[PDB]
Write a protein that binds this DNA or RNA. Structure first.
Ligand SMILES: Nc1nc2c(ncn2[C@@H]2O[C@H](COP(=O)(O)O)[C@@H](O)[C@H]2O)c(=O)[nH]1
Lengths: 90, 154
RNA sequence: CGGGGAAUCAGGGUUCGAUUCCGGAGAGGGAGCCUGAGAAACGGCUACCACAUCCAAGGAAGGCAGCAGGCGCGCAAAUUAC
RNA sequence: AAAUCCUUUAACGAGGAUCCAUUGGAGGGCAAGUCUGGUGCCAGCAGCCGCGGUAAUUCCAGCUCCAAUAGCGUAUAUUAAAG
RNA sequence: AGCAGAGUGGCGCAGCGGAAGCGUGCUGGGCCCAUAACCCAGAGGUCGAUGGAUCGAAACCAUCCUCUGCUACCA
């Protein structure tokens, strides 16, 4: 898979306290904490862990919720680290 | 017109009081060396503010020595007289009572005269002092918030 | 509001009936009465209770659940006509 | 009553007779397309079962077809279906 | 400033003065389709500075250094 530097109505978030039955509740790099729903294709196929970097589809009506578009890993995190993502660790 | 404007000031008063001390306010203290220290219960500390201004009820912390805490400063006094704010480099003798814990922190053992005193600012406090604190809030010292939220990790 | 009735329907039934005909009731809420063959009448009066109109502040005058029309209420209803 | 409408009747008035028929469906229930673009368990459809995760008979469209037709959807009270 | 209860990544054990190991955690295998539990092995020790009679990291004359808790006068 290729790198995706997409900040077009969607934000990067650090997964924290992933408790729910799909609820998630991560902490977005720009704004405050939000409930990011596990999107259809990520239900069983791709596993998001207790501490993870994710690209979340910022759904802008209510803004107190969202849905996880992409899961990242160490190499892509280290790349994102390189360009634009706060000195916040990966 | 008068009734509406009166209600605006009344709601500002009603907002300020009963939702107090959550807006901890940005405060960076430099220790004034060779001042008469009271050890514990209470702590009488002669200080000079370097970044922001200092009022009563702001929780304080010492970094570098892990992250040790002194909760809720009770009174700030110049010489003998009481003052509401620090004058950006004043010789204020402050009376501080640490919050009820298992042990209060001690001068010399935990924190030294060289160590910096920084206010405990969080997401809740910064969000609380962002909106509905823009008239009493500081003039051109803003940056220290962005400079201290980065080291407190926000 | 009650009937005459209405919708549905094999037979049995179920549901509706404020609404043009018949009977009852009330004119914002109660109460009291004059006149008359007939009223406890309200497009009659008298008082209180609730609302509200004029005013020279002394006093005066109120009743659409008649036909139009307006406000409100609400998902919900027509022309100040001859 | 005075008018109106209708009926009656001079003159005008039909070739995309452009003087234009809509409202809902086309997997099953249930009559009608495994036709072609688009989207990719996102957008949406779906009374019920279900259809959508890169060849969608069901979504957004084009074409075609079906139903009733100056009408046909949708919601809600109620009756038959309810032995 | 003083007092007090302790010093091995990490919870405690230990002696007769000759002489340092246990549970838990970490790492590498195996068993199982997989995890856990189990079964094999591994690494991790200046016992805070010790002057002393010496067979002393030790017992103390606690001499001294470190950490934790408590007491002491509020400008
Ligand atoms: N491979 C394997 N997975 C198991 C077994 N038992 C449970 N699991 C895992 O545990 C899940 C739920 O089992 P239980 O509800 O904990 C299963 O879907 C599976 O992933 C087993 O015997 N073998």
């Amino acid at each position: 898979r290729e790198l995706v530097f997409k900040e077009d109505g969607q934000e990067y978030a650090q997964v924290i306290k992933m408790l729910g039955n799909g609820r998630l509740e991560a902490m977005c790099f720009d704004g405050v904490k939000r409930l990011c729903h596990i999107r259809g294709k990520l239900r069983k196929k791709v596993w998001i862990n207790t501490s993870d970097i994710i690209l979340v589809g910022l759904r802008d009506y209510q803004d107190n919720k969202a849905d996880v578009i992409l899961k990242y890993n160490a190499d892509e995190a280290r790349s994102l680290k390189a360009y634009g993502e706060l000195p916040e660790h990966a | 017109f008068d009734a509406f404007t009166k209600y605006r000031q009344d709601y500002k008063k009603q907002k300020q009081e009963e939702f107090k001390h959550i807006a901890v306010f940005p405060c960076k203290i430099k220790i004034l060396p060779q001042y008469i220290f009271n050890s514990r219960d209470p702590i009488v500390m002669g200080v000079t503010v370097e970044a922001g201004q200092v009022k009563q009820g702001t929780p304080m912390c010492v970094p570098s020595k892990n992250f040790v805490d002194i909760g809720i400063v009770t009174s700030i006094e110049i010489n003998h007289k009481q003052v509401d704010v620090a004058k950006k480099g004043q010789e204020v003798c402050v009376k501080i009572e640490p919050i009820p814990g298992e042990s209060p922190k001690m001068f010399g053992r935990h924190f030294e005269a060289t160590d910096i005193l920084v206010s405990k600012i969080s997401r809740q406090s910064i969000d609380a002092l962002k909106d509905w604190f823009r008239d009493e809030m500081q003039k051109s010292d803003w940056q220290l918030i962005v400079e201290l939220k980065k080291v407190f990790e926000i």
